[PDB]
């Protein structure tokens, strides 16, 4: 029982439950459920063969297999999903050693693909931080906009050339940087640091279930640093993602803020 004050979620439960699930794994479709189907080993171990032997990083993987296992994992993954997903990556980054301990364990994975939607036309306060996946047809082909992550400092006397990355937005100031004798005042410069890429293009929903005499209503979201021009733009495609929200700068005279919040979706994956 070790948890955020306002939640009910923990790393170890989901980690162990999923590591047992992938040990409860021979391709549970093609070896437990669809026994009439067959590729008989945990596919992720098989992939750690067929990924490492392939040497072909950035896996793609769903989690709809998990319906058989304990559904509490499903739920607390549905609802608290930027704080359990790295734990399932940690389990994979442990699985590395099940099949190759002394590998070049320096690369990471990419990654869901299981839950439903009906349409974008009408959603709710409940549906705020939850898993969604919807589809349509693409409109645009954007450019890239990067994003910073750290400050690289300078100095005046004796080269107090300090450095430090960001939580998300602050660096502290005592009289010097990481207060080292304060031979001079605080320093900062913003380039020799960590940056991060993205874009933005929107989608037009285009099902056969489009309500009567209704217009296009359309959605949009950025990317992450590998999910960037996967895309010959403009075709029938699905996304997964996490409904996101953001407050808005009222007016623009000063720091007033809006009542109304704009929304878009977190940036994960696509489908063909």
């Amino acid at each position: 029982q070790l948890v955020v004050w306002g939640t009910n979620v923990v790393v170890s439960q989901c980690k162990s439950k999923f590591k047992s699930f992938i040990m409860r794994f021979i391709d549970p479709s093609a070896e437990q459920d669809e026994i009439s189907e067959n590729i008989n080993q945990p596919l992720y171990l098989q992939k750690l063969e067929e990924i490492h032997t392939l040497e072909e990083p950035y896996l793609n993987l769903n989690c709809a297999h998990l319906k058989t296992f304990d559904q509490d994992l499903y739920r607390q993954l549905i609802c608290y999903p930027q704080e359990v997903i790295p734990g399932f990556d940690m389990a994979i980054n442990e699985m590395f050693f099940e099949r190759y301990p002394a590998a070049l364990l320096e690369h990471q994975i990419q990654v869901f693909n299981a839950d439903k939607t009906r349409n974008m036309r009408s959603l709710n306060p409940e549906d705020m931080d939850q898993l969604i996946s919807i589809s349509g047809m693409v409109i645009r082909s954007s450019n890239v906009i990067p994003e910073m992550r750290e400050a690289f400092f300078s100095c005046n006397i004796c080269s107090f050339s300090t450095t430090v990355e960001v939580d998300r937005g602050r660096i502290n100031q005592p009289t010097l940087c990481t207060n080292c004798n304060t031979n001079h005042c605080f320093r900062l410069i913003h380039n020799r640091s960590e940056f991060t890429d993205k874009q933005l293009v929107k989608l037009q929903e285009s099902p056969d279930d489009m309500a009567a005499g209704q217009t296009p209503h359309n959605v949009l979201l950025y990317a992450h640093n590998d999910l960037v021009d996967k895309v010959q733009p403009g075709d029938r495609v699905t996304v997964t993602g996490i409904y996101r929200a953001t407050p808005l700068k009222t007016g623009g005279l000063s720091s007033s803020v809006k009542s109304v919040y704009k929304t878009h979706v977190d940036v994960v994956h696509f489908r063909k």
Binding site: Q214, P216, A245, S256, V260, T263
Partner: protein, 601 residues
């Protein structure tokens, strides 16, 4: 002046002593039922009406401000728990905050809500909850609206409460916290969405009825802001009536553009009312033809046209083979200039046919009836903003004198002949729009009134491409008949000396009863037994021979056979027996034959 407290006693008496035995069936607890529905965690909104408190007393018939009463009753029953753990997101999330351990609005969990127009809306109406009907305009969409966030101090730990009523705001800074008070131990301030409370939020403009606006007047609109549960509760162009409040709008900001006491008002919502149950009475009546007898009484005779329409009213033919759909909508064409009162039946249908429309011979060029584009360097970009033909899905958009609009105008409408497909490479798309509208064509003959020498397409000037898209083409001419116009005359004059035409030949059917009986029809999906398939394909050939035996005659499309198929199964929807049979198509062919063989003799 009045006490806002002793009324709390009054309402405690009201709701507590609430099993009001006016009828067999009220000794049970009514708002106790709703109470336990709160205890069901189900109802998040209760309701007030004039009758409810009207019996109670007569003050508050003019006391209820509509504002203080609401927060008072809300807090009143919030502290009322006469009555299970994981029911809500936030509700259990507080328990998560209490696992180691508020205003009752931050645990909102429920709500309550409770013969004049904007023109009459005299400017002493502030605060009063009043009634007006209009028309919706400029359909928009809904987003979340904060009320009070939880700006935790982290180092201190004190989920700050910023309960807000405004529409604009300002952040909360580092810490108004007890340990973050003069006691030097402090962090910074930062919200937690999960524990935060927000609310749905729909807005759209409201335009005037257009039946009141005097000779020297121009309709104007107001704004609608309906938040919370009632979102998504009206579409564009619904004639709707709203009871709510007029409330001004403290547009704070600049100190010289405001500062006039500007008062750009707006409205607060409660409801969107828009002006089987019948089954026992539907058991009382079992007839097919009486619809024509009580639908559109205003003219005697010419039933055949009407029954042809009522079929389109009927519907019920569709299939999705091969992955592809099939057009299950009937589209009549109409030529003639007698006095028919196409305008009559058009108004009649457009009134009774819910989700109706109307356009005229030049009022909508090709971009207006469909989507279109615009221009302005003051609001942003432009969109499609589809037209009547765009909007009229699940219904009919009725053009009058399509012959006279324009020849190229036949194009885009012809595009919608293949239904639900409105292609637009105009706003950088090949967009669809789902043109799912039944289509009504009515026009007049060419120069003359069906000059018998100038033959079809000799007297007419219409490309075959559109006639092929039309199931039925109908010329209406009635030459001098000594006896004909008599009956029609006295018939007309009946509602001139009187107000209701048809006496003592049928039971008239009101718009409600008509629509409801039609409402029971279309979901049969009836049976067409297999002998028809061999039989009907034979009967169709009977046409194709007497089409070819004269060489100056009409061409034929596959839709001729597809149509004669398409009509019959529909009418079984109003037979309500799932039994497409011989009569089901014998009337189909019968009416097809009556569509023709009428101008030579």
């Amino acid at each position: 002046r009045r006490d806002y407290a002793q009324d709390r006693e009054s309402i405690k008496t009201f709701l507590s002593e609430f099993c009001k035995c006016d009828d067999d069936g009220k000794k049970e607890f009514v708002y106790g039922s709703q109470l336990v529905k709160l205890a069901h965690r189900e109802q998040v909104l209760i309701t007030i009406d004039l009758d409810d408190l009207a019996e109670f007393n007569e003050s508050l018939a003019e006391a209820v401000n509509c504002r203080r009463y609401t927060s008072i009753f809300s807090d009143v029953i919030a502290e009322l728990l006469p009555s299970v753990h994981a029911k809500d997101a936030l509700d259990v999330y507080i328990e998560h905050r209490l696992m180691m351990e508020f205003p009752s609005e931050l645990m909102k969990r429920f709500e309550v809500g409770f013969a004049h127009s904007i023109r009459e809306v005299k400017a002493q109406h502030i605060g009063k909850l009043v009634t007006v009907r209009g028309i919706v305009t400029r359909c928009t969409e809904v987003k979340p609206m904060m009320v009070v966030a939880t700006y935790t101090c982290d180092r201190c730990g004190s989920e700050t409460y910023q309960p807000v009523n405004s529409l604009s705001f300002t952040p909360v800074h580092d810490c108004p916290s007890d340990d973050c008070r003069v006691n030097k131990a402090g962090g910074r301030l930062y919200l937690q969405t999960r524990g935060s409370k927000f609310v749905k939020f729909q807005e759209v403009k409201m335009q005037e009825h257009s039946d009141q606006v005097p000779v020297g007047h121009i309709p104007r609109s107001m704004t609608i802001m309906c938040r919370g549960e009632v979102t998504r509760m009206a579409q564009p162009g619904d004639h709707i009536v709203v009871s709510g409040v007029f409330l001004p709008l403290m547009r704070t900001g600049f100190a010289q553009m405001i500062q006039g006491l500007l008062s750009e008002t707006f409205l607060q919502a409660h409801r969107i009312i828009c002006i089987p149950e019948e089954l026992e009475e539907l058991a009382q009546d079992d007839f097919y033809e009486r619809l024509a007898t009580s639908l559109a009484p205003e003219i005697y005779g010419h039933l055949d046209v009407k029954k042809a329409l009522l079929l389109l009213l009927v519907g019920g033919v569709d299939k999705r083979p091969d992955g592809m759909k099939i057009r299950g909508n009937i589209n009549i064409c109409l030529m003639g200039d007698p006095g028919v009162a196409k305008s009559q039946l058009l108004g009649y249908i457009s009134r009774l046919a819910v989700r109706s429309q109307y356009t005229t011979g030049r009022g909508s060029s090709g971009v207006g009836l469909t989507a279109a584009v615009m221009k302005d360097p003051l609001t942003g970009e432009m969109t499609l903003e589809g037209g009547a033909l765009v909007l009229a899905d699940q219904g009919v958009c009725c053009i009058d004198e399509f012959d006279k609009m324009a020849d190229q105008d036949r194009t885009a409408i012809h595009e919608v002949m293949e239904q639900q497909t409105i292609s637009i490479a105009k706003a950088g798309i090949m967009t669809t729009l789902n043109a799912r509208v039944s289509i009504l064509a009515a026009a007049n003959p060419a120069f003359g009134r069906y000059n018998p020498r100038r033959t079809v397409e000799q007297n007419i000037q219409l490309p075959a491409a559109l006639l092929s898209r039309f199931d039925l083409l109908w010329l209406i001419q009635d030459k001098p008949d000594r006896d004909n116009d008599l009956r029609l005359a006295k018939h007309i004059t009946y509602v001139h000396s009187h107000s209701k035409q048809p006496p003592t030949r049928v039971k008239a059917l009101d718009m409600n009863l008509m629509r409801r009986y039609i409402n029971l029809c279309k979901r049969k999906n009836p049976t067409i037994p297999d002998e028809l398939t061999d039989y009907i394909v034979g009967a169709y050939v009977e046409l194709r021979r007497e089409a070819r035996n004269q060489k100056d005659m009409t061409f034929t499309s596959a839709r001729n056979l597809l149509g004669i198929l398409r009509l019959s199964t529909a009418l079984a929807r109003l037979r309500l027996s799932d039994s497409v049979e011989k009569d089901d198509v014998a009337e189909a062919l019968r009416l097809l034959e009556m569509s023709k063989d009428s101008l030579n003799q």
